[PDB]
Amino acid sequence: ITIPKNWLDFGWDIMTLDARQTMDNIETIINEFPEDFGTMLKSIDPRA
Amino acid sequence: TDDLYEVAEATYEADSSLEAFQTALDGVNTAIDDVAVSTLQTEIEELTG
């Protein structure tokens, strides 16, 4: 049963770490919207 | 008595050959001591891995 132990330690990152990988991508992707909103405020403002 | 001394020595042929059974049953244990204990090593390589 050390066969599992050998295969696990790298393999489980696909669940363990990839969640964190992909969320930071998602969180930075989402931050394009606060950016965009910031752009649209800075462009709507001069109408007044 | 002689007729029973023949039986005595007949018990002693069987006695002496039962020392041969000590070889055939007791020294013959050794395969146990091998196969129980030359046999983690093949599986330990999945620790080394």
DSSP A1-48: -HHHHHHHHHHTHHHHTHHHHHHHHHHHHHTHHHHHHHHHHHHHGGG-
Report the gap between the CA of A9 and the closest CA in chain B (Å). Answer: 11
Q: How far apart are alpha carbons A16 and A14 in whole angstroms?
A: 6
| Chain A residues with CB-CB distance to B44 below 8 A | 2
Determine what percent of chain B falls in helix, strand and coil, rounding each to the nearest 5.
Answer: 85, 0, 15
Picking from B40, B43, B44, B46 by the largest number of A CB atoms within 10 A of its own CB, the best residue to mutate is B46
* CA dist., res. B2 & res. B9, Å (int): 11
Report d(CA B16, CA B44) in Å as an integer. 45
Residues in chain A with CB shorter than 8 Å from the CB of B46 are 2-3, 5-6
Q: How was this structure determined?
A: cryo-EM
Residue B19 DSSP symbol: H
In angstroms, this model's resolution equals 2.4
